[PDB]
Enzyme design. Sequence first.
Site, PDB file in Angstrom:
ATOM      1  N   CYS B 176     -26.379 -29.454  66.736  1.00  0.00           N
ATOM      2  CA  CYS B 176     -27.611 -29.228  66.146  1.00  0.00           C
ATOM      3  C   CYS B 176     -28.302 -30.665  66.323  1.00  0.00           C
ATOM      4  CB  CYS B 176     -27.546 -29.050  64.450  1.00  0.00           C
ATOM      5  SG  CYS B 176     -27.155 -27.259  64.024  1.00  0.00           S
ATOM      6  N   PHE B 227     -28.836 -19.405  61.168  1.00  0.00           N
ATOM      7  CA  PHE B 227     -28.885 -19.889  62.663  1.00  0.00           C
ATOM      8  C   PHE B 227     -29.824 -18.636  63.129  1.00  0.00           C
ATOM      9  CE2 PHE B 227     -24.238 -21.110  61.871  1.00  0.00           C
ATOM     10  CZ  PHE B 227     -24.833 -22.491  61.542  1.00  0.00           C
ATOM     11  N   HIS B 315     -34.432 -32.764  62.194  1.00  0.00           N
ATOM     12  CA  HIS B 315     -34.026 -31.180  62.401  1.00  0.00           C
ATOM     13  C   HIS B 315     -33.697 -30.493  60.962  1.00  0.00           C
ATOM     14  CE1 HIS B 315     -31.360 -27.987  63.819  1.00  0.00           C
ATOM     15  NE2 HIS B 315     -30.561 -28.398  63.072  1.00  0.00           N
ATOM     16  N   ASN B 348     -32.967 -21.776  61.962  1.00  0.00           N
ATOM     17  CA  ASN B 348     -32.246 -22.962  62.481  1.00  0.00           C
ATOM     18  C   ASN B 348     -31.829 -22.427  64.087  1.00  0.00           C
ATOM     19  OD1 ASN B 348     -30.556 -25.068  63.283  1.00  0.00           O
ATOM     20  ND2 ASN B 348     -29.176 -24.945  61.586  1.00  0.00           N
TER      21      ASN B 348
HETATM   22  C1  LIG Z   1     -27.395 -23.243  52.363  1.00  0.00           C
HETATM   23  C2  LIG Z   1     -28.617 -23.886  51.224  1.00  0.00           C
HETATM   24  C3  LIG Z   1     -30.000 -23.192  51.804  1.00  0.00           C
HETATM   25  C4  LIG Z   1     -28.523 -23.227  49.755  1.00  0.00           C
HETATM   26  O1  LIG Z   1     -29.280 -23.347  49.001  1.00  0.00           O
HETATM   27  P1  LIG Z   1     -29.419 -24.153  47.591  1.00  0.00           P
HETATM   28  O2  LIG Z   1     -30.595 -24.802  47.102  1.00  0.00           O
HETATM   29  O3  LIG Z   1     -28.371 -25.142  47.898  1.00  0.00           O
HETATM   30  O4  LIG Z   1     -28.701 -23.078  46.594  1.00  0.00           O
HETATM   31  P2  LIG Z   1     -27.233 -23.580  45.651  1.00  0.00           P
HETATM   32  O5  LIG Z   1     -26.717 -24.792  46.410  1.00  0.00           O
HETATM   33  O6  LIG Z   1     -27.938 -23.601  44.376  1.00  0.00           O
HETATM   34  O7  LIG Z   1     -26.416 -22.309  45.990  1.00  0.00           O
HETATM   35  C5  LIG Z   1     -25.817 -22.203  47.082  1.00  0.00           C
HETATM   36  C6  LIG Z   1     -24.499 -20.986  46.828  1.00  0.00           C
HETATM   37  O8  LIG Z   1     -23.768 -20.997  47.898  1.00  0.00           O
HETATM   38  C7  LIG Z   1     -22.889 -22.209  47.922  1.00  0.00           C
HETATM   39  N1  LIG Z   1     -22.654 -22.990  49.204  1.00  0.00           N
HETATM   40  C8  LIG Z   1     -23.920 -23.580  49.854  1.00  0.00           C
HETATM   41  N2  LIG Z   1     -23.653 -24.141  50.674  1.00  0.00           N
HETATM   42  C9  LIG Z   1     -22.092 -23.949  51.003  1.00  0.00           C
HETATM   43  C10 LIG Z   1     -21.137 -24.265  51.804  1.00  0.00           C
HETATM   44  N3  LIG Z   1     -21.737 -25.216  52.790  1.00  0.00           N
HETATM   45  N4  LIG Z   1     -20.116 -24.227  52.059  1.00  0.00           N
HETATM   46  C11 LIG Z   1     -19.489 -23.210  50.916  1.00  0.00           C
HETATM   47  N5  LIG Z   1     -20.570 -22.945  49.793  1.00  0.00           N
HETATM   48  C12 LIG Z   1     -21.784 -23.324  49.816  1.00  0.00           C
HETATM   49  C13 LIG Z   1     -23.148 -22.901  46.501  1.00  0.00           C
HETATM   50  O9  LIG Z   1     -21.718 -23.512  46.040  1.00  0.00           O
HETATM   51  C14 LIG Z   1     -23.513 -21.843  45.724  1.00  0.00           C
HETATM   52  O10 LIG Z   1     -22.310 -21.037  45.357  1.00  0.00           O
HETATM   53  P3  LIG Z   1     -22.141 -20.807  43.792  1.00  0.00           P
HETATM   54  O11 LIG Z   1     -23.394 -20.012  43.174  1.00  0.00           O
HETATM   55  O12 LIG Z   1     -20.855 -19.999  43.877  1.00  0.00           O
HETATM   56  O13 LIG Z   1     -21.880 -22.445  43.173  1.00  0.00           O
HETATM   57  C15 LIG Z   1     -28.574 -25.224  50.902  1.00  0.00           C
HETATM   58  O14 LIG Z   1     -27.418 -25.766  50.239  1.00  0.00           O
HETATM   59  C16 LIG Z   1     -28.736 -26.033  52.650  1.00  0.00           C
HETATM   60  O15 LIG Z   1     -29.735 -25.643  53.185  1.00  0.00           O
HETATM   61  N6  LIG Z   1     -27.437 -26.423  52.826  1.00  0.00           N
HETATM   62  C17 LIG Z   1     -27.636 -27.165  54.106  1.00  0.00           C
HETATM   63  C18 LIG Z   1     -26.860 -26.190  55.190  1.00  0.00           C
HETATM   64  C19 LIG Z   1     -26.319 -26.861  56.461  1.00  0.00           C
HETATM   65  O16 LIG Z   1     -25.075 -27.719  56.237  1.00  0.00           O
HETATM   66  N7  LIG Z   1     -26.921 -26.606  57.404  1.00  0.00           N
HETATM   67  C20 LIG Z   1     -26.389 -27.466  58.713  1.00  0.00           C
HETATM   68  C21 LIG Z   1     -25.780 -26.189  59.645  1.00  0.00           C
HETATM   69  S1  LIG Z   1     -25.202 -26.653  61.579  1.00  0.00           S
END
Ligand SMILES: CC(C)(COP(=O)(O)OP(=O)(O)OC[C@H]1O[C@@H](n2cnc3c(N)ncnc32)[C@H](O)[C@@H]1OP(=O)(O)O)[C@@H](O)C(=O)NCCC(=O)NCCS
Lengths: 401, 401
Positions: B176, B227, B315, B348
């Site tokens: 990414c 993705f 990104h 993404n």
């Molecule tokens: C994924 C995403 C959209 C979720 O939205 P959010 O506003 O965080 O929503 P929340 O965090 O309140 O809830 C997410 C749920 O999934 C879980 N979760 C989020 N990211 C996670 C991860 N990377 N691994 C495991 N669990 C994850 C949270 O713990 C929560 O679970 P829970 O209700 O059992 O506690 C946000 O965390 C995000 O954009 N994360 C970045 C993703 C990333 O790393 N992208 C790069 C990819 S190369």
Amino acid sequence: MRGSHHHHHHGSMVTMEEIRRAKRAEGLATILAISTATPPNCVIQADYPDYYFGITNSEHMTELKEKFKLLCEKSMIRKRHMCLTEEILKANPNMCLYMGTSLDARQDISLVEVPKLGKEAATKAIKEWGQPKSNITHLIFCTSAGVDMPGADYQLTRLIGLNPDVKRMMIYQQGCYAGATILRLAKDLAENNKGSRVLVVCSENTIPTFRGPSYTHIDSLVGQALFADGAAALIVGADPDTSIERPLYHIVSASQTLLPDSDGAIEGHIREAGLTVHLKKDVPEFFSANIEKSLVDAFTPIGISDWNSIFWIAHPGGPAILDQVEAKLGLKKDKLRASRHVMSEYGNMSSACVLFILDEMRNKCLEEGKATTGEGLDWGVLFGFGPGLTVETVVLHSLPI
Amino acid sequence: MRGSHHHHHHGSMVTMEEIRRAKRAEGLATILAISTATPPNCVIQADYPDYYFGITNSEHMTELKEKFKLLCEKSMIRKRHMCLTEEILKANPNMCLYMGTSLDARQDISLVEVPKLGKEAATKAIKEWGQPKSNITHLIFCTSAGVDMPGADYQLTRLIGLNPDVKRMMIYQQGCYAGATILRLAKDLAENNKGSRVLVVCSENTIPTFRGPSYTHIDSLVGQALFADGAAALIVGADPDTSIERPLYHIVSASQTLLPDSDGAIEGHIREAGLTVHLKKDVPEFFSANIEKSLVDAFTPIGISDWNSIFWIAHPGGPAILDQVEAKLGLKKDKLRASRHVMSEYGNMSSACVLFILDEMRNKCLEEGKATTGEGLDWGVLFGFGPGLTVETVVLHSLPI
Ligand SMILES: CC(C)(COP(=O)(O)OP(=O)(O)OC[C@H]1O[C@@H](n2cnc3c(N)ncnc32)[C@H](O)[C@@H]1OP(=O)(O)O)[C@@H](O)C(=O)NCCC(=O)NCCS
Ligand SMILES: CC(C)(COP(=O)(O)OP(=O)(O)OC[C@H]1O[C@@H](n2cnc3c(N)ncnc32)[C@H](O)[C@@H]1OP(=O)(O)O)[C@@H](O)C(=O)NCCC(=O)NCCS
Ligand code: NI
Ligand code: NI
Ligand code: NI
Ligand code: NI
Ligand code: NI
Ligand code: NI
Ligand code: NI
Ligand code: NI
Ligand code: NI
């Protein structure tokens, strides 16, 4: 005001030009250190046909074994180094088949081994160079032995302890021409960035390519006779401080071209069975037939047309390629000596070969009291050959010994 | 002397010096055209939970499905384009498992799709540029959707009909941040080679990352929510002829760094099950906590310290990443507009995102009558985020509209 200068309507644009002038180097990229590494385990080529057909449970495939024996005999290889041991193969029966589901097992071993062997070569190159590793601004890592995220470049960076802001370029799966490719890359990185010192590492092994014999793919037997393990490292820099750094070669120009009508001649697929390699019988004919066009395009701006008047580094992956080029061009029999010396002592280490060969050539030149690192000559050519079909052509200039 | 004369070429010092004098461009690498492409098939995010849990025969995983529904609703993605159709997935039950043996089936589709989609974007970029494709001297191809030998760079070259002498750099599996990586690469290639014109193509898709749900890897569910497919193409060159070429952005500097203590936060493995992706929950915290150091290192030499006074391309790997960067730095709410716009409309698309976003910003700037391609501002930053953890930081300069 009016005069022999132009103007800019923005100060920010003037600032950009000041930045560009200050960010760039002046001279040609030079090689400042070269080092190599091999796994300790080594197989004698003369004993490999019995060993290979044994470990792959193929003693009954009599015609096939006879072909492979001829391949190992024509290979002009004395020994090869391999991370892959009898013990490892015994623990991985699927790698011993021709197409066993085995990528995960190959990957679990190779992805650790690649930067490990690379670090060993890098450490030596850094030691020869003599400068602190915190002065390395760039890293080029090259391998075709296993892909991962983050890559072998990240792993090497952490293993050595390079600066976190080291500028990395990861060159994956470019095969046997990639030793030249990363010289082509290092030249632009070093020349366009002032004071930049480029660590260049390649690391290759047979873990994803080893497989049992098959009548379906005799071309695979060719690979099993040739491929080997090896790593090489370089320090490349423009504007060397000659009071502490010692130039070995200038990287003058670097070209790459595709051979016409060669489409499909060499292919390599990353599959559930690992890295499969397919080779048409036509491959040496394609390279020997086209190599002079690359010499002419590279050396015409230099004024050279006599291919015996330059020193030679040619990827020795297939002996037939070197043999047919030698004959086609009428090369003296000693021109490809350093190239054939590495093939004989190490086998086909893919991208690493041409760097082993540079090291071999500068070493022999030093200990035989030759006038230059280029066997007494000024200008030289370094060739990478591989999938495409692709020829990489690097023009080098030697340094006095 | 009196007699017949033959000709002589210049010696080494004059020849070396003339080569060095003639080799380089003068100005900064500049983006001259941008084009994008997506597969025709599109999935609406509001319908994706039902679609995803249905096609993977996981309708009974009601608890997980409810979580995935929250992931898709929080994703801030409206729609995504995907080569992968319902029809393809039904024919590949192993891709629908969480860890089914399926790499070969994934490769058979992806290795064709990657250069194909890339070709669509490249053709448009060349058309915008307006020059004959024979003037393209360099090609950078970037993908994380499938590795092959020869690579997608070769495939694109034959599909488009680039010069066989085109200098290729194949950037595989850098994930990414690689959209910034290839700007960093194109900068050195273009600036160190006089008259060079670089075609830069990236092409990403979900074919190797698609997989069924798992209670063990909620992080995989995160990937399935985000993705997407997309390709982008650029023409990059230094010293543009402004009578036939039209500059959009100058690539001023390009840095890369690794985040402290971030080991393993983002991983991607090429396995028998395809491309597995793992994401720690700490990923947005890591980027937002460390990003200002990258801003300082890039912009202090330019004299800038106010991050709202520059235009932004970031990104959009996770909306959480952008949200926490915005909050941490005190960014005005419109700074990341174009970035979140691409995320909303496309999801993404890995490396392609930042190039879609550049295109979105210059398009909007042109049609809204802004003063520059950088939303009326002069200086800008472009960020790639990915495995390492790695932050790529590119400083850009806008062009006046
Ligand atoms: C994924 C995403 C959209 C979720 O939205 P959010 O506003 O965080 O929503 P929340 O965090 O309140 O809830 C997410 C749920 O999934 C879980 N979760 C989020 N990211 C996670 C991860 N990377 N691994 C495991 N669990 C994850 C949270 O713990 C929560 O679970 P829970 O209700 O059992 O506690 C946000 O965390 C995000 O954009 N994360 C970045 C993703 C990333 O790393 N992208 C790069 C990819 S190369
Ligand atoms: C492998 C090599 C050293 C063998 O030496 P050689 O002079 O070809 O030996 P011979 O031709 O007498 O015998 C080789 C046998 O293997 C066969 N063979 C060799 N390469 C083959 C291929 N790629 N596909 C199918 N068969 C092949 C030959 O046809 C012959 O088979 P046969 O005895 O049943 O007719 C030589 O072919 C070579 O170096 N080839 C280049 C391989 C290559 O492209 N490597 C990668 C370079 S980047
Ligand atoms: Ni084959
Ligand atoms: Ni001449
Ligand atoms: Ni020796
Ligand atoms: Ni005369
Ligand atoms: Ni004359
Ligand atoms: Ni004369
Ligand atoms: Ni003269
Ligand atoms: Ni996971
Ligand atoms: Ni839009």
